[PDB]
Amino acid sequence: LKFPKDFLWGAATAAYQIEGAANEDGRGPSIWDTFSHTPGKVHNGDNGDVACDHYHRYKEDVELMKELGLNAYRFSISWPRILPEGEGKVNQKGLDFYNNLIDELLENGIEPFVTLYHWDLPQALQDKGGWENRETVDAFAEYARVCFERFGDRVKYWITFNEPNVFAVLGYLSGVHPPGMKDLKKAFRAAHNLLLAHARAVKAYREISQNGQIGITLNLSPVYPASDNEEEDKAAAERADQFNNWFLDPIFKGKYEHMLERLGEQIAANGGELPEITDEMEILSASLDFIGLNYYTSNLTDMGWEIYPEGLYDLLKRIHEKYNLPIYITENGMAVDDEVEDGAVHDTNRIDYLKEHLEAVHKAIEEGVNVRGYFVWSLMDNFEWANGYSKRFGLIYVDYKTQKRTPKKSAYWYREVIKSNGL
Ligand code: HEM
Ligand SMILES: [Mg+2]
């Protein structure tokens, strides 16, 4: 099973999950700094102040990427590390770090695959409403333009938002993620501003006219756990179904030109309050060079062992057949209760997970689906949001007391997969 000629072999991370240095070098706080320092919001009281200390250890981490032989590396830029208040003064040391990361990746032949927004909205913007406030759209447009001007000369692949469908549900409907709302009308309002923000970032990208591609990331198969009181999960599940069904409308499913109008009219229905739209609709008519898919499991509770690589194949066909755009598997991986035993981590079940999902990807590719890349989640164990560090997704084990990286068995297997360009 060989893969296309210039296929992207990579792994993915996100800024707040690995970087650390949360309160150093001019970085402003994100809502996840606020959230993880509030009692009872994150497992075991974990936070990402230190995380993997990737901010300080990136050269060692890139060296391990080179040992794995990664074509590309997907990461996110920390918005409050570039703009501590989300807008205005640019943090110089924050630019230096990402400029250094990008040069170090290119020096070793790893292509940056850069997410603008991976959920670390600057708290200052959240103080005045976050995505409920149209000014956050203004700030995301400026912040997107800033990364395009400082880094766009070396980054070829950009992602505006990572899973805006998941963030909307978790942060505005079930309230398990910041800003912790359980309100459907607020979620539609935030989704609307998120839509404008994406289009204005896409607009800003084409005005700078760099020869690269910009897209979005979606998790069309989201799975949410069962809390510990069923009444709220019922109310959160019912709010989520109303929100998801709205975006899965049979006649206007992927047509985001009409989605913005219907959304603003639906906002106008219950609340009104809708400001002018410059040209976003004609941007959202064709807003993507590629679509990134984040696949972990399928919706059809689990016992623990069930993997659904057949569902990733099914998703790949139907997305390809309906939207006819290049597809990147921007995230795929499995959490395992990993331990280090005599310098090794035998995560063979993770090897079986990735192996089965890759032959599903190869099946889609053989039937014409234009899959251009694959990224394991994650490159290393990291801060798994509200689960804290209790969930290890990495190809590389991180011992958080010593910050030592130990490549798991899955890392050596993946190196052989990349070297063969297939299975
Ligand atoms: C503000 C940003 C966005 C939000 C909040 C959002 C929201 C959603 C939601 C809730 C779903 C359904 C999730 C599920 O399947 O359970 C969805 C599906 C989808 N979204 Fe969006 N979306 C956004 C941007 C976009 C854009 C800009 C595009 C493409 C130009 C896009 C393409 C799709 C596609 C292809 C699907 C799958 C629809 C299908 O089943 O045919 N999304 N989105
Ligand atoms: Mg073994």
Provide the CATH number for the domain around residue 264.
3.20.20.80
Q: Which residues line ligand 1 (CB under 6 A)?
A: 161, 164-165, 168, 191, 194-195, 198, 216, 218, 220, 222, 243-244, 247-248, 253-254, 256, 287-288, 322-323
Q: d(Cα 400, Cα 381) in Å, to the nearest integer?
A: 9
- Domain contains 302: yes
Q: d(Cα 235, Cα 4) in Å, to the nearest integer?
A: 45
- 5 CA distance to ligand 2 middle (Å): 31
Ligand 1 atom closest to the CA of 287, numbered from 1: 30
227, 244, 226, 361: which is closest to 293 by C-alpha?
361
Catalytic residue among 19, 111, 163, 384: 163
Element (H, E) at 34: helix 31-36
- 360 CA distance to ligand 1 middle (Å): 23
- Determine which residue's CA is closest to atom 18 belonging to ligand 1: 247
- Domain contains 366: yes
Ligand 1 atom closest to the CA of 197, numbered from 1: 1
CB-based contact 114:155 (threshold 8 Å): yes
| Tokens linked to 38 | 């509030």
- Domain contains 2: no
Q: Is the peptide bond before 84 cis (omega within 30 degrees of 0)?
A: no
- Domain contains 348: yes
- 84 CA distance to ligand 2 middle (Å): 45
- Determine which residue's CA is closest to atom 20 belonging to ligand 1: 254
Closest ligand relative to 410 C-alpha: 2
Q: d(Cα 262, Cα 34) in Å, to the nearest integer?
A: 34
- The upper half-sphere exposure of residue 315, i.e. CA atoms within 13 Å in the direction of its Cβ, equals 27
- Domain contains 40: yes
Ligand 1 atom closest to the CA of 243, numbered from 1: 10
Q: Which residues contact 188 (CB under 8 A, 6 or more apart)?
A: 243, 246, 263, 266, 267
28, 51, 2: which is closest to 121 by C-alpha?
28
Q: What residue type is 6 in one-letter code?
A: D
- 409 CA distance to ligand 2 middle (Å): 7
- Domain contains 1: no
Closest ligand relative to 413 C-alpha: 2
Q: d(Cα 50, Cα 30) in Å, to the nearest integer?
A: 14
Number of domains composing the chain: 1
- Determine which residue's CA is closest to atom 8 belonging to ligand 1: 165
Place of tokens 């996840």: 32
Q: Are strands 291-295 and 213-218 parallel, antiparallel or unpaired?
A: parallel
Q: What Cα–Cα distance (Å) separates residue 141 from each residue in 189, 282, 339?
A: 18, 17, 43
Closest ligand relative to 160 C-alpha: 1
Ligand 1 atom closest to the CA of 161, numbered from 1: 2
Place of tokens 């240095």: 21
Which residues constitute the domain of residue 65? 9-420
419, 299, 422: which is closest to 354 by C-alpha?
422
Q: Give the resolution to one decimal, in Å.
A: 2.5
Catalytic residue among 111, 132, 280, 331: 331
Q: Phi, psi (5° rounding) for residue 374?
A: -140, 130
Ligand 1 atom closest to the CA of 323, numbered from 1: 35
Within 79-134, residue ranges assigned H as helices are 79-82, 92-107, 123-127
Under DSSP, the state recorded for 220 is S
Please indicate whether residue 163 is annotated as part of the active site.
yes
Cα 342 to chain centroid distance, Å, stands at: 33
Q: What residue type is 400 in one-letter code?
A: Y
- Domain contains 392: yes
Q: d(Cα 33, Cα 29) in Å, to the nearest integer?
A: 6
Q: What residue type is 95 in one-letter code?
A: L
| Tokens linked to 321 | 């057949």
- 219 CA distance to ligand 1 middle (Å): 9
E strands of 136-241, at which residues? 157-162, 213-218
Q: What share of the chain is helix, strand, coil (3-state, %, to 5)?
A: 45, 15, 40
- 410 CA distance to ligand 2 middle (Å): 10
Torsion angle in degrees (nearest 10) through CA of 85, 213, 154, 415? 110
E strands of 199-272, at which residues? 213-218
- 408 CA distance to ligand 2 middle (Å): 10
Please indicate whether residue 104 is annotated as part of the active site.
no
Q: Is the peptide bond before 378 cis (omega within 30 degrees of 0)?
A: yes
Q: Phi, psi (5° rounding) for residue 217?
A: -120, 135
Pocket test for ligand 1, best of 195, 216, 218 (most atoms within 8 A of CB): 218
| Tokens linked to 191 | 């989704």
Closest ligand relative to 346 C-alpha: 2
| Tokens linked to 83 | 């703009």
- Domain contains 4: no
